[PDB]
RNA sequence: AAACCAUAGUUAUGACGAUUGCUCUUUCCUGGAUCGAGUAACCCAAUGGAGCUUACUAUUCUUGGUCCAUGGAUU
RNA sequence: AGUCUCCCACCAAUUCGUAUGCGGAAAACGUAAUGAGAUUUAAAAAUAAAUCAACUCAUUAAGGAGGAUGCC
């Protein structure tokens, strides 16, 4: 305890060095100092169990459970220290050795019910096997009995027990997935997972919730040609072409639901899809859980000719985003033999800007148990630093086709990945193996990683693919192997895990859609819009005292001239209402059947065969008001008023069938950027720019300056009519990649193809301020 | 929506003795030295610019109008000044009998209020 | 109502007697305060804790309201209460608050030290806590030890008589007042007026003008010398007329019949109230079903 | 709650105001002439005394007592006349009025007291002062070769006022 | 930018010429004002509106802005302008301002008596109005006189110079400024500075407080030396299209 | 030598203007127009989250219920 | 806001391998049914102590099959 040794230690430093306080993401607070407390229900049972004193001699009907749980109670209350029952109950003051060892364990349980058949123990000392259903669905994988009881309705991912301690969870679509971590991450997500060049880290997401369907033909001929028809029908004629089959590049598009079996048939978009072809007669399909079953049963209509494996409980995947992503993954993977596909992986893990790489960058090989390393380690890459654009062109010719196929086909076969577990090691025996390295023969090495045996250790097949549209890396692995890998991947000093909200933000920044929230032309996007968000908003609205919330139907000067139908704001206050858009636009179009000049209102013509005349626009608005709260708030009806843009041309249309809800009105998807102040939130409205005041708005766009020299903002803002509504905004916030507010939304198709300019007006819900913006198309 | 220009007072008291109170204060040139002395003792040179108008002074019940923005100043100082041997040996004081903002309250049997009523309206000129 | 909680009784301590001129000045200023519109008037007393109180318990207060100011109460119909304030400088000096709280109707203590401030906020039976605003306050006012004594039966008092006396004391008054309203969160406060002559008195419209300039709003300043001082009087009067605020020796219904509103009717020497037996057991049990009052 | 504060950064300019001088015109020379040091007869007490004098005359008792409750002079340097003063948030304008309506500090005459910035925290006025000194040094070393200002009235001062008296956290 | 537009030019009438020491003082005070932060500056000139104006179209503005100060419009970026302060006392004596309009940029007026004050707001060609805040303004001025002119394109001006010279003038200044503020309902007020010396100038972030603690709202204190003072200069320059 | 990293981030959240809501109310024709007052109390981040425990809304900002509590009218 | 709990490294097993009415990764956490007590008590000060409410405590594994009470 002499400071002389402290001075000697500091002699390896300066005289008086100064150390910083910890960064705020690496700090923890002190918990309590006394031992933990047991629940009372586990105390009473144990106390009453120990206080108890002690026709084929079994006679154990429903008493087997009582014995098998009394044993656990006795063990717990004889082992744990936190158990403070009373003074008398002890290990020896009451018969605990005699009980449950020579009284219950063998005399009672063993002598009543003989062990059931299937005594095939396992090839493992850790429960690890396959859960696949050939031509049928599969159940939850068996595991710990306590934690398999809670998965009766919503399943678990392999990492759930790990994420639950560090995130906010939710429950949807039969899974208990992760929503967002417990720290603010708005800017860090952008500058580590966005398209910036300031990235010094990566983002990893456990996307095991996305299913996997391995479909394959059974004609025994490698030419197939019938799975081709199924895949070409399932989507548009896209995913069966020379680019995707022979070159085996990944596919991302839209997946339909064909039903052609008797005369009249149609199709309805469902959502995104990932189709990967292998050897021209095997296909892998990845789908969002919500549309998993509906397509699946469709394939089951032809299982006479194909074969399907619901392997969603046997294959896991992880998604990686960022610049230094492959560098971090390559720090926790080694091989068994020498393979060229690891040489390419070693070379390409040194790019740091993955947009330069070509369309196809598939890797596939066989790794060893990642628990050998005991610490992530670089690939000695600093030696070579003269990568140029000439070796990249070699990657398009030196492609190891056979070496990829051979290692790939060890994933589309259940018994192969069953052999993959042939001998999975426990933690203690790996520890002992590592300890045996302190007495090695080289005696001049001091190695840390354990060696690898030639045949008495398992080999893990592994695939890595690149998604171009989303710009990220998929890694596909067997299910039970995911947990050992994921433990190392989070020991990198600058690796962060993200939830589902961060995924939405990332795909928003890159001007791309998002299947759950931003597909109002799909059967489930429409439900999420008009049935799930609206309830969540109204429940917290009408449950505030009046006057402490925004009044919606009492707003002044919204439009240039006021129609007495709606006192305040137009449409529903809580969601992007598309039914009103369809009815209003169709009525506006019909009001110009042969009278080009519309007209707003005639002063008190009359009140109303159930006549509903179509004279004035106020009549259209009151028709829309009538159709709601009195036709679908007391009954049900389903229709898809929102199609998607089609390559064909069916623009125009026209007392027999003149209903205002019978024809779908085509729209397109756009992104609008604001030239001046503004901050578009969700559900805001998008108006066309009136022919009058076009010069004023153009002048505002060019710039109007005060005598001081700044910009002029406080002027007279002119207003448009109510029949100038052409679109809605479904996602919008401050866009950090450009520094100005930006939104993404949908606009009516026929509106844009008649604008003499490229400007629109944006206003939120519950406000009367009109901001200017310019819109650009999104190719989706 | 609204605007206020003037504030009207009704303030009157002297030393609470009546034996010396018979030396009645002169009309205005003692109700003008006293107020200036108060507004100087309480606030400095910046406490001189308060512009106030005498409306129909009386024997003791003086009436005053002051700017809207000086109500904070005036009422704070007149209530905290106590003179000494200024005009007579007896120190004086003020008590604010009433305050208003419309000049339409608390007048008894008078003709002066006919003036300051309509001829001096805002006139939109 | 309208109430003033401080009018200094002219005397140093139990040593010297009071001259007649001071008493006549007190009568004149009392009449002036009545003229301004005040109904209940207190009368203060200032003694230091480090001095002997007389052993004979009868002489613990020489104000003697019942027979010094009878005629003024006859004409003006005023209500007069006695009050005492004690200087607290050093604890462990004897002379507990047992008997001095018996003869008086309100007991208050002003501290002039750290130990005094600690003692006079957690472990005393006082009902008013005051400082000396014409000097330097002993301590920076902690934000927690003042707000945690308001929740007991203690209140703070502001006296504006220091704002009309001299020139150097005005700065100290402004600073200390700002400090007190800042630290106490401005919840329980009352206002008195240590006037030594009729010249220094002010009415309700001329006491809010000063205080509103030091931060306090107007409505709270109106409630200051309103029901709050009435509650102070109630706490002061429920200490010798009841056991633990549970059994008072008061009277019946009718306006102006309470333990504070009634001063003449209660024999304070014996603390009884003999009244005409007008209510018996054989009469109808309602308001109007029986008609005889 | 907690009491707020404001910090004021005040300089002292000594203009020449004398005839028959005919100075040169250039951004370097004007600053180098107006920014001479203080004659050291002023002190930390003289400024405070003079700013108390200028309040009880241009304002009254209720104007000289709402500011004197909390008014402390923290840091002052003579090589460059910059100084820092502290006051209540709601009563900072009156101190500024005292600043302008006051000239002729003590016995020194012909000068201007110039408040240049006011801010809440103390950590930020330090950064502002550093940026100000850097800006002055940049503008004095760019008109020509810097050493044509060799008199070194201020050049050796900005570097050497780093944290010598600015350790008042 | 900052605009200060009441720097006086050392000349009393059309007879005398400018000496050397006067211009020497003017250059120093201009340099000091440039240091304190001001960028745009105007130069004043006082006449009596009842004197023999030079008949020729030249030498009626002896400022001579393009020869003098030529070494200050470069080597430092501050720009300079010209103005004249007519003093109006009688409702007559001709000399209509159609002549001097082309020879200046800003024309002001300094009424003295009631007839002059009511003439000034009646029909002239001024674009700014000023008062003698030194002492003894003709008091009891009401919204009636000022509303008509301020509704049109006219502005009021404060100088704050007289608050720096002597206490006796300071008291009159602070008395009259309150009246002029409350009579116009805080509309169209701008601030100049009467700088007779390189000592009587001041910064910005305090004088705004000097006007805010007298009655002007804090929203208007930030536009006196700013947008309004810029607009008056912009219009005055755009008047030069007479040619 | 660092690990320094927040759509509030270190004891900062300022000084003011112009409209619309809401409560009460003077006169009227989630009803419409007028006259005049309020928009509070409890209080304030210091690494983050899930819980619990306390403080508040006295014709002095507001909204909803229950009572084998009391007084009147129903009956 | 606080004199308060839990989480923010792993464990096929000297680490709460804890199927325990239900929810929860856990909690000095939430909630359902039946039933009972308050210094004379499992217990509080010398929450309740006419009724209902409030405080505290005791008991109660999921799935599926078979028969019956009641209504179609």
XYZ file of N, CA and C in Angstrom, chain A residues 596-675:
240
model
N -68.835 23.226 -68.620
C -67.434 23.360 -68.235
C -67.288 24.195 -66.970
N -68.083 25.254 -66.840
C -67.971 26.169 -65.710
C -68.695 25.579 -64.507
N -67.938 25.211 -63.477
C -68.533 24.726 -62.242
C -69.258 25.867 -61.538
N -69.931 25.534 -60.440
C -70.608 26.546 -59.646
C -70.712 26.027 -58.220
N -70.483 26.908 -57.245
C -70.351 26.436 -55.870
C -71.701 26.232 -55.188
N -72.488 27.294 -55.034
C -73.743 27.156 -54.310
C -74.773 28.125 -54.866
N -76.018 27.666 -54.932
C -77.143 28.527 -55.262
C -77.941 28.748 -53.987
N -78.268 30.005 -53.705
C -78.766 30.399 -52.390
C -80.168 29.844 -52.177
N -80.252 28.734 -51.442
C -81.512 28.170 -50.963
C -82.456 27.845 -52.128
N -82.017 26.886 -52.944
C -82.900 26.337 -53.967
C -84.020 25.527 -53.328
N -83.658 24.491 -52.580
C -84.606 23.661 -51.844
C -83.810 22.844 -50.833
N -84.516 22.004 -50.083
C -83.871 21.162 -49.097
C -83.040 20.049 -49.702
N -83.701 19.072 -50.314
C -83.016 17.910 -50.868
C -83.273 17.779 -52.366
N -88.267 9.806 -54.470
C -87.443 8.717 -54.978
C -86.087 8.697 -54.286
N -85.989 9.387 -53.155
C -84.697 9.583 -52.522
C -83.776 10.441 -53.359
N -84.296 11.539 -53.908
C -83.555 12.331 -54.881
C -82.334 12.955 -54.221
N -81.187 12.841 -54.890
C -79.941 13.489 -54.482
C -79.365 14.133 -55.738
N -79.782 15.363 -56.021
C -79.341 16.018 -57.241
C -77.877 16.432 -57.130
N -77.286 16.735 -58.283
C -75.843 16.914 -58.392
C -75.590 18.321 -58.932
N -76.411 19.277 -58.500
C -76.306 20.636 -59.022
C -75.048 21.341 -58.516
N -74.937 21.533 -57.205
C -73.897 22.367 -56.621
C -72.848 21.520 -55.914
N -71.664 22.109 -55.720
C -70.579 21.364 -55.086
C -70.880 21.130 -53.612
N -71.620 22.042 -52.981
C -72.063 21.792 -51.617
C -72.892 20.521 -51.540
N -73.614 20.193 -52.613
C -74.354 18.940 -52.641
C -73.413 17.744 -52.618
N -72.288 17.826 -53.331
C -71.308 16.743 -53.285
C -70.728 16.605 -51.884
N -70.411 17.734 -51.244
C -69.870 17.672 -49.889
C -70.875 17.079 -48.906
N -72.151 17.449 -49.024
C -73.135 16.881 -48.109
C -73.433 15.425 -48.446
N -73.270 15.026 -49.712
C -73.359 13.612 -50.063
C -72.258 12.815 -49.382
N -71.037 13.346 -49.387
C -69.945 12.677 -48.690
C -70.196 12.632 -47.190
N -70.739 13.713 -46.628
C -71.070 13.712 -45.206
C -72.127 12.661 -44.883
N -73.135 12.528 -45.745
C -74.186 11.536 -45.540
C -73.636 10.119 -45.638
N -72.781 9.862 -46.632
C -72.258 8.516 -46.837
C -71.467 8.012 -45.636
N -70.946 8.907 -44.809
C -70.211 8.529 -43.615
C -71.100 8.710 -42.391
N -70.833 7.899 -41.365
C -71.505 7.940 -40.067
C -72.952 7.475 -40.154
N -73.440 7.217 -41.364
C -74.797 6.722 -41.539
C -74.893 5.597 -42.556
N -73.794 5.215 -43.197
C -73.781 4.079 -44.106
C -72.654 3.098 -43.827
N -71.531 3.541 -43.260
C -70.461 2.623 -42.905
C -70.055 2.680 -41.439
N -70.623 3.579 -40.637
C -70.417 3.529 -39.197
C -71.445 2.661 -38.488
N -72.483 2.211 -39.197
C -73.439 1.255 -38.667
C -73.477 -0.047 -39.450
N -72.746 -0.144 -40.557
C -72.676 -1.363 -41.348
C -71.278 -1.464 -41.944
N -71.035 -2.545 -42.678
C -69.728 -2.819 -43.253
C -69.800 -2.851 -44.775
N -68.703 -2.435 -45.404
C -68.516 -2.511 -46.847
C -67.037 -2.315 -47.141
N -66.543 -3.041 -48.138
C -65.124 -3.048 -48.468
C -64.963 -2.653 -49.927
N -64.033 -1.741 -50.191
C -63.687 -1.357 -51.551
C -62.298 -0.743 -51.525
N -61.594 -0.858 -52.646
C -60.255 -0.294 -52.782
C -60.340 0.869 -53.761
N -60.588 2.050 -53.206
C -60.661 3.286 -53.969
C -59.317 3.745 -54.516
N -58.220 3.114 -54.120
C -56.878 3.541 -54.483
C -56.181 2.415 -55.236
N -56.097 2.504 -56.557
C -55.186 1.629 -57.303
C -53.786 2.212 -57.370
N -52.923 1.611 -58.183
C -51.586 2.128 -58.427
C -51.473 2.446 -59.913
N -50.487 3.274 -60.254
C -50.284 3.677 -61.640
C -50.000 2.467 -62.522
N -50.651 2.424 -63.680
C -50.520 1.326 -64.624
C -49.892 1.818 -65.922
N -49.157 0.920 -66.582
C -48.483 1.281 -67.825
C -49.473 1.570 -68.947
N -50.677 1.007 -68.875
C -51.690 1.229 -69.900
C -52.278 2.629 -69.738
N -53.317 2.938 -70.512
C -53.898 4.278 -70.548
C -55.419 4.171 -70.457
N -55.957 4.430 -69.267
C -57.390 4.334 -68.994
C -57.854 5.570 -68.228
N -57.498 6.753 -68.734
C -57.688 7.977 -67.961
C -59.166 8.316 -67.797
N -59.852 8.586 -68.907
C -61.157 9.229 -68.872
C -62.262 8.230 -68.532
N -63.473 8.759 -68.361
C -64.657 7.956 -68.081
C -65.883 8.809 -68.367
N -66.843 8.247 -69.097
C -68.049 8.973 -69.502
C -67.715 10.300 -70.182
N -77.729 7.691 -65.763
C -78.717 7.575 -64.697
C -78.935 6.118 -64.309
N -78.035 5.247 -64.766
C -78.116 3.819 -64.475
C -77.180 3.421 -63.338
N -75.880 3.677 -63.495
C -74.890 3.422 -62.444
C -73.995 4.659 -62.368
N -74.417 5.634 -61.562
C -73.688 6.886 -61.394
C -73.244 7.095 -59.952
N -73.120 6.016 -59.181
C -72.696 6.133 -57.794
C -71.277 6.681 -57.714
N -70.991 7.378 -56.618
C -69.717 8.056 -56.432
C -68.680 7.187 -55.731
N -68.956 5.892 -55.558
C -68.000 4.997 -54.918
C -67.838 3.685 -55.679
N -67.924 3.706 -57.007
C -67.914 2.481 -57.793
C -66.638 2.281 -58.595
N -65.868 3.337 -58.841
C -64.693 3.210 -59.678
C -63.443 3.646 -58.929
N -62.355 2.893 -59.038
C -61.109 3.289 -58.376
C -60.417 4.411 -59.132
N -59.875 5.362 -58.379
C -59.229 6.539 -58.944
C -57.718 6.397 -58.801
N -57.019 6.341 -59.931
C -55.587 6.063 -59.934
C -54.790 7.224 -59.349
N -53.709 6.900 -58.633
C -52.846 7.904 -58.020
C -51.390 7.533 -58.274
N -50.485 8.425 -57.854
C -49.046 8.184 -57.908
C -48.413 8.646 -56.601
N -47.174 8.210 -56.386
C -46.426 8.484 -55.165
C -45.316 9.479 -55.456
N -45.221 10.527 -54.635
C -44.291 11.624 -54.863
C -43.592 11.986 -53.560
N -42.512 12.752 -53.699
C -41.800 13.357 -52.583
C -41.712 14.858 -52.819
N -42.142 15.641 -51.832
C -42.244 17.088 -51.956
C -41.266 17.763 -51.006
N -40.489 18.697 -51.545
C -39.527 19.482 -50.789
C -40.000 20.925 -50.716
N -39.763 21.563 -49.575
C -40.249 22.909 -49.311
C -39.176 23.935 -49.640
N -39.550 24.945 -50.424
C -38.628 26.011 -50.789
C -38.484 27.060 -49.698
